[PDB]
């Protein structure tokens, strides 16, 4: 679970990097489709599975919007992301395992972009947070 220290650590980092939420998302999903191409299947309803693509830039925008939402809901992710869970569930049906993959891509991007801010401390708390988020997105799967 997220401790006060964890909630504090995530909030501070997100107040510091939140300005670039749009770039972080595009870069993260691009990385995902390049480094873990199997994730392309979920987007195969488009002949456009490529980094920095309009469809790629867009989802990423929506992904980081969900992450800023989760920060705002950090005290109860499960409730905070019911809607988000429902979409990827009954609709898209994304294997919950890809959330972990995206999370790793998200940490790499933030690492590349905010090396001073991404201390190990902000890392452990952010990593704890994204697993919380992952487990939150899975709530309506089964």
């Amino acid at each position: 679970s997220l401790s006060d220290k964890d909630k504090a650590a995530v909030r501070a980092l997100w107040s510091k990097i939140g300005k670039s939420s749009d770039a972080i998302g595009n870069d993260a999903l691009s990385r995902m489709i390049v480094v873990y191409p199997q994730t392309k299947i979920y987007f195969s309803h488009w002949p456009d599975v490529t980094p920095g693509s309009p469809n790629i830039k867009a989802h990423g925008k929506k992904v980081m919007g969900g992450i800023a939402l989760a920060v705002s809901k950090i005290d109860d992710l499960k409730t905070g992301l019911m809607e988000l869970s429902e979409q990827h569930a009954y609709k898209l049906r994304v294997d919950p395992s890809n959330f972990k993959i995206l999370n790793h891509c998200i940490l790499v991007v933030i690492s590349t972009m905010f090396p001073k801010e991404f201390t190990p401390e902000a890392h452990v708390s952010l990593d704890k947070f994204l697993s919380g988020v992952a487990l939150a997105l899975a709530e309506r799967y089964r």
Partner: protein
């Protein structure tokens, strides 16, 4: 690769007495209730609405019996599982667009259903060789994904 003779026999033992018409339907149904996201790939199958319905869905049964036979090539081509499933991999990746993570989930369900059947005779050592074989098959299936 590399299989002890024992492993070779265990696998041959397992398949020799495998009731495909029984294990298959049971494995795919169980997968669809415990990992409901796998229900996505069986849209034309009809009723997926609940457990009971999955358990008594004929299309699921017939497809489960089929998927388990898919393993046959691997066990008859034990020293070349990569090559043996290259085509099937491509089929799953480019035609069916199947998330290769579900390959591991289904092996798990298969594994547990066979375990219900073989009972106490499903020893640790027998499990180890079946999972090993199932693992190689799962590796072989996700190679053609890029």
């Amino acid at each position: 690769v590399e299989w002890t003779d024992k492993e070779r026999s265990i696998i041959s033992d397992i398949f020799s007495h495998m009731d495909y018409d029984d294990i298959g339907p049971k494995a795919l149904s169980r997968c669809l209730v415990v990992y409901p996201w796998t229900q996505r790939y069986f849209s034309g199958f009809g009723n997926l609405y609940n457990a009971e319905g999955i358990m008594s869905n004929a299309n699921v049964a017939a497809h489960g019996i089929k998927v388990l036979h898919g393993l046959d090539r691997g066990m008859k081509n034990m020293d070349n599982i990569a090559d043996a499933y290259t085509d099937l991999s491509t089929l799953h990746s480019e035609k069916l667009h199947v998330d290769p993570d579900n390959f591991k989930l289904l092996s798990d369900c298969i594994t547990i259903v066979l375990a219900a059947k073989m009972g106490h005779a499903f020893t640790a050592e027998t499990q180890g060789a079946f999972q090993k074989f199932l693992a190689a098959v799962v590796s072989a299936l996700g190679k053609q994904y890029h």
